[model samples]
Target chain A: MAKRVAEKELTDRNWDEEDEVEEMGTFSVASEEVMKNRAVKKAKRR
Target chain B: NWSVEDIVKGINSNNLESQLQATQAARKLLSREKQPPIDNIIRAGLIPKFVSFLGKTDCSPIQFESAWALTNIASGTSEQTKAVVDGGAIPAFISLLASPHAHISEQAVWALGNIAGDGSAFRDLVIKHGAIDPLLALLAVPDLSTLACGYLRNLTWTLSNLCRNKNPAPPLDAVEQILPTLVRLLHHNDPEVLADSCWAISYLTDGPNERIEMVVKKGVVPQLVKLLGATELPIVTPALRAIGNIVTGTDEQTQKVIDAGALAVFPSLLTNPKTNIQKEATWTMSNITAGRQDQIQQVVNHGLVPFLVGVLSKADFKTQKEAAWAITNYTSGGTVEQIVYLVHCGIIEPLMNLLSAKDTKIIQVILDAISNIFQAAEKLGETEKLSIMIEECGGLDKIEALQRHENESVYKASLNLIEKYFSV
Candidate 1:
């Protein structure tokens, strides 16, 4: 696969998972009502 | 051979004795039998009956057995667990957490742990029905028994589930309520409690700066640092994870972990026999090195640069990549003297070797690291000297080769470095 880089693009910086590292660096946290409602909507679709 | 059919029949019988006997059989069979017939029990339509037993107030035995049965059932596959949820077990489980009897409440805690661990939705459901308050109360009981210790262990594990996962996170207010308790449990005598509480805090701090600040304000950084040196993998993993999450926040937050003596622990962690721990150590360093110049100097002064260079060359590919990030982040952000120190520490060769990697982002950072070093060299009138050193290490040939790389940014940067330094 061909891989390639800008001045800003060219500048060296710390890479994260979003940088194509694809590794999780920490656990996660998020909203209860939103989480529940999303589950409800998904279940309704099913 | 005890018959599940007889058990089902007993559970369905009108006699209270029969109901109690059958529920006990079902609970034992579900837990003790190897490869138990979880789906068969669910199909026998016992989920609702078991859930109903949770309310047998005068019959604590029946309530305990039913809650125990439901707990094991929820421990099955997701669909089997969902069957328990669909049977309306969440409220029953939540209510039982408040039972006057220790054994029953403990059973309820076990059952709720299984339910919440199934998915984020069930976690929310458990939280929504008020699982947190009763769960936290279990932690504060004085003159704890062996059973109570086990209860606290399960309680902390259940609390971990409630905190784990995102995309609708366990509501912030709910997390807020548990943070202080989590901090208290960080100093617990049981390693299990320590590990699980660290996990819960890791989950809580893994989000925004606000959340990290919430944990930092509770004074967990010092304990988290202490656990990094722990012998138990379970203890170290979540402690490292929590510390890792804290560093990912603002520079001030990253410094808090460092100031807590985390920087002192990195040398051993980076060299740890467990590659997972070493790799995470580098990733944590990556975030810290990305901070202000003083922070990068802290990494350098801690004598981690040489270890990172070794990791970039010798560690597993994933670990090496993270090691690369730590080094490259330093190159970009460190003072010129720091870059000079890194170059002298033999970082250039391995960094150049990594340029052959196919991950464009890795290649880009390596090139940028090289550029930053060159920028420093140019400042000290050593561009030609550093250019020759790279050439001696075959780095010049690699850079020249990258000029034709398929990725435009890579080739352009390669050409720019060569034109600026290698040109006649």
Candidate 2:
């Protein structure tokens, strides 16, 4: 059989096969480049 | 080199600058590489005596250096970290979270992080002293100077480590309490803040399914995916670990991450050079593969099986185990064609070879994967093909030798393999 696909809500906590909702959210190390990108993304995300 | 004696004497004066000098002296003198002064500070009663600064009224100068100094002390060894805890520092630290001065709260969080990071035993002290709420409350105050930005960076990370603790009575409740802040923290502009927020989520997800659901229900997924788009290992590594835990939740939980486009970030993360990121990313993949058939299909479409195979074949112990677990889940939850995909990706031979390895948990998961493949093939009426693949991969004899294995689950799994496919 061919593979199947489906969509889900970002906060969906349903874990059984029947429900399709989901959930998500972790680090260390310091990087100027990374921190700079973080500023950019923070702007876009906001 | 100022003597610990003079420094210890200075900290106790009823005057402001004198107290600052004492604590600051302790801070300058203490270093992890050089243990004498650290031991001297602890022996000098720095934790209990200096930590008292956080609770004192009009004590910012005292609070500033004392919290800073204890942070250094807590950063030492387990025994040294224990000294801070045993010195009765937690309550004073917890109260300091309420300090109006951003710097003081920051240092309080920094010291608490070192204590919690030591391990679960000392972690219990932080919780019993009621540190969770105020620390969670501290996130509202913004932090930075040329020095202060780094201070707040340590603060969020410190909270991450505190949230990272799972001493049982707390964390499960403590994580749920702190998670909303953490989830909010993902949106903060600082990279370390975002990275540490995700790292905190990783440990929270390490709890039981109920607590796992707690992190997920807070709508933490999108924030994580957003970080995934970034190329930073600092952000991505912990994000992968958090995602690693997310996928381990229910089918809907796993599907939610996939739907949020977690898979879009998969190729870059899996192919990345860093094994820490690679291992965590693989774990996330395994959990996703273990989900519903539709979810497994998502993993395959993203081209994960080949990478999973690569890790299993070549990566270190932690990465290999997760890769193997992913294949195990894949075989168990996958369609007949999906089962064939494992063989095509060269999983069967390496999997069979793993049966000889020690570590009962690894053996059990390996057996489960083979059993799954055998069962899947049987269901598809293709046992003959599976038998040929097993024999070719030397699975049959390897499994037979496991019949006398020490672990019941392993031997039973081996017996089932023989009964199902061998002894005909």
Candidate 3:
């Protein structure tokens, strides 16, 4: 019941059940590009 | 034809062989065809005898029989509970629970659990004598398979009932030690073990929201949901009941269980063919949904309401009461439409009727339903309606009666409602 997505699509779709045709980014592992983005965001002090 | 008094005397007498013979005869008397009154009398007598036997010094074959007899006797009665306690049975029974002799220990645990009543009366006895350790130790034992399984099952039940009781707050250390074992038992091959473990875990964390979060951190919800698919109704019912109990206690735990995937399993069980299973599942679902409209919306999206309503349609009074209570709990914080839905589904009237139930527990549950709706309504910006609902339900006056009730759950729910309603 899981689907994969590209990193760029993270912000393009809502997590609602009806927003299905969108290619959701699967940030499956900590080492993925999503993690890099997360790290960069964390390093930048709010 | 023996009076319960005579049978109890036989079990209590010093003549060991004669006591055994008398107990054997009494067991036969219990088994014989009889009216409910006679049956109850026989059952009543059995408990005192069993308690008497628990204190007897001779651990012979007759003692073993008596122990077994006590296990059977304790399993069914509430009256014999004090007798067992007064006979100084708990320590010996705790030893048996920890005994190398698997059969003896197993029977002892079962008897101990039946006599445990609510955990408060014997909290010191259970904890001081190290009953928790032996029960946890059973998790590691390899033999006496089925019997050991039953022993632990009852042990958890006793522990759960004890914890749920208001008088005795179980020691944190005891809860900490027993919780992991209960969690592990969720994965056991025996479905009964899984069921009782769920019950125990649920009971332990139920009264306090903080403890509920602690249990969530141990990852119990996921394993519990996995048991939803177990073939046995016994396992499935208690697991669902536990899920309900867990979520009902705390907002964080409710969110955790939902996030952990109870949302998926809960609806499926609601439609299961087994009436009792469906009853517990609906109760669980209702509890989780109570005051949490967001979760109810999710549950509706997953398709639970129709089946729940269907169960309400043809089920017995108890089932109907539980289903109505569930709907009341689930829709407590939802729209005017949600309250309308409960009324439309024919729940409100029964629930209102339940408000007058002779059983204080039933009455408390009804008040909780009212409290949930009022709190939810207040949260949803329907203060006028909340005020009206409270006043119509006899708000403060009825709440005072509930507050005065002996049971802690009733008192807390009543006090909470009064505080919330009259807050502004």
Clash pairs, candidate 3, are A5-A24, A5-A25, B96-B105, B119-B162, B290-B329
Would candidate 1 be rated incorrect, acceptable, medium or high by CAPRI criteria? incorrect
DockQ of 2: 0.01
TM-score of chain A of each: 0.22, 0.20, 0.17
Model 2 chain A, poorest ten-residue lDDT window?
A37-46
- Per-residue lDDT of B99-197 in model 3, one digit per residue for the tens? 556666667766666666524766656677877777767666554355455566666666664444445566666677766766666767776566557
Residue-by-residue lDDT tens digits, candidate 1, A1-46: 0100001110001212232334413212114433343211000000
Candidates in order, TM-scores: namely 0.83, 0.67, 0.50
Ordered by DockQ, highest first, the candidates read 1, 2, 3
Estimate how well candidate 1 is docked, as a DockQ score.
0.02
Question: List-wise, what DockQ does each model earn?
Answer: 0.02, 0.01, 0.01
Residue B266's C-alpha lDDT in candidate 3? 55
The count of residue-pair clashes in candidate 1 stands at: 7
Find the candidate with the highest TM-score and give its number: 1
- Write down the lDDT of every candidate, Cα atoms only: 0.79, 0.71, 0.59
Q: Model 1, residue B84: what's the lDDT?
A: 92
